[PDB]
Amino acid sequence: MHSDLTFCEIILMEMESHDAAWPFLEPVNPRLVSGYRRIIKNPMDFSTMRERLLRGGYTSSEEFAADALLVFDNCQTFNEDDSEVGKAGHIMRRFFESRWEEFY
Numbered sequence: 001m002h003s004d005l006t007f008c009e010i011i012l013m014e015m016e017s018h019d020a021a022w023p024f025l026e027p028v029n030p031r032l033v034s035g036y037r038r039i040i041k042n043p044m045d046f047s048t049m050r051e052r053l054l055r056g057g058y059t060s061s062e063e064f065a066a067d068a069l070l071v072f073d074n075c076q077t078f079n080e081d082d083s084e085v086g087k088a089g090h091i092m093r094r095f096f097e098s099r100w101e102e103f104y
């Protein structure tokens with residue numbers, strides 16, 4: 001749908017610009033994060049969804065939502081809930097779930 005994916009733009013822009021978005025704008029650099037490659041099989045981040053979305057690489061809004069949920073799953077997999085990335089991921093995750101349900 002044009003509408004299904006016109007909305008994925010709105011929310012991704014809103015995540016891209018959220019105060020808590022800083023852990024997720026770029027891919028995690030495994031050279032700098034010991035253990036990340038080993039633990040996180042499928043990395044995901046906002047710039048990667050942005051690339052895929054501009055490219056037309058999403059066919060349904062469900063695919064987009066899967067990529068968003070994967071950012072936060074990988075976050076909670078790797079970081080303790082009281083870590084700084086962890087605290088930021090809970091804010092970004094709660095923002096995403098609520099903004100996504102407000103539409104669907």
Ligand SMILES: CCc1c(-c2csc(N=C(N)N)n2)[nH]c(C)c1C(C)=O
Nearest residue numbers: 022023024028033036075078079085
């Ligand atoms: C802790 C590193 C990390 C960042 C990140 C972005 S920027 C930065 N470093 C400073 N602000 N010093 N860390 N993002 C995610 C999703 C991470 C992990 C391992 O899950």
Ligand SMILES: [Mg+2]
Nearest residue numbers: 069070072073
């Ligand atoms: Mg889940």
